[PDB]
Design a protein around this ligand. Structure first.
Ligand SMILES: [Br-]
Ligand code: NA
Length: 243
């Protein structure tokens, strides 16, 4: 509409994100388009405008600001602040494991975003490193797109809770060691989460403090009620695990 599409980057759940120039507002923004009018159906319509409304209610600074949303030309849009940086997924591939304080710094900011989300009643079922965008000075945003996998999934999700705390702890693990806690294929991984002994990160890389195994053990403890209640408490413990 008032916008003019540009480079296809980002691949959200229901929509596909483009970079876009807001010609009225005279700035470059990220714009998600729920493409091809899949939500002619009111069930998609109301849902993706319900959580769009909760998204722009958020005030936490590690969540992308929402500029605007509504309809133009039948198409439902969400206009948001454009951010630069790389995936945690991209970092890890290209940089190996992170120095623990860096890992912690990143986990702290995303857990913060997650807590805020939960608090406004838009709980994320999980986190992928591919949903973590690291900017200038290790500033990280939680984004809802790419450019879900079993590597980061709590067991309670497979049958009949806040599962994001579990996910974040897998993500923390990966930042430390270099790889997700459970390897193998979808079957063996799914099983590993239900059953395999939680890994002890210090037993992999040299420079990882002991206190962390406890954090990971708690953070991806088997019974949901044994884990941290917030990502904040995760963060706190993680932080405290630097000697
Ligand atoms: Br990088
Ligand atoms: Na949470």
């Amino acid at each position: 509409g008032p916008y003019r599409l540009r480079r296809l980057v980002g691949r959200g759940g229901m929509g596909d994100v483009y970079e876009a120039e807001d010609t009225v507002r005279e700035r470059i923004v990220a714009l998600k388009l729920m493409s091809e009018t899949l939500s002619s159906d009111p069930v998609f319509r109301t849902r993706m405008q319900r959580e769009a409304r909760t998204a722009g209610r958020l005030q936490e600074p590690h969540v992308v600001p929402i500029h605007d949303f509504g309809e133009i030309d039948g198409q439902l849009y969400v206009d948001m602040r454009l951010i630069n940086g790389v995936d945690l997924a991209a970092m890890l591939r290209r940089q190996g494991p992170l120095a623990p304080p860096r890992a912690v710094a990143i986990v702290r900011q995303i857990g913060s975003a997650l807590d805020a989300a939960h608090a406004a009643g838009a709980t994320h079922r999980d986190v992928k490193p591919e949903n973590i965008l690291v900017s200038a000075d290790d500033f990280a945003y939680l984004v809802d797109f790419g450019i879900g996998t079993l590597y980061y999934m709590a067991p309670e999700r497979f049958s009949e809770y806040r599962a994001d705390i579990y996910a974040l702890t897998c993500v923390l693990y990966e930042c430390l060691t270099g790889s997700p806690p459970y390897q193998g294929d979808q079957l063996s991984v799914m099983g590993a989460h239900i059953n395999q002994a939680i890994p002890r990160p210090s037993t992999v890389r040299p420079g990882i403090p002991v206190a962390f195994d406890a954090v990971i053990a708690r953070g991806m403890a088997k019974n949901p009620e044994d884990r941290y209640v917030t990502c904040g408490d995760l963060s706190a413990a993680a932080h405290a695990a630097l000697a």
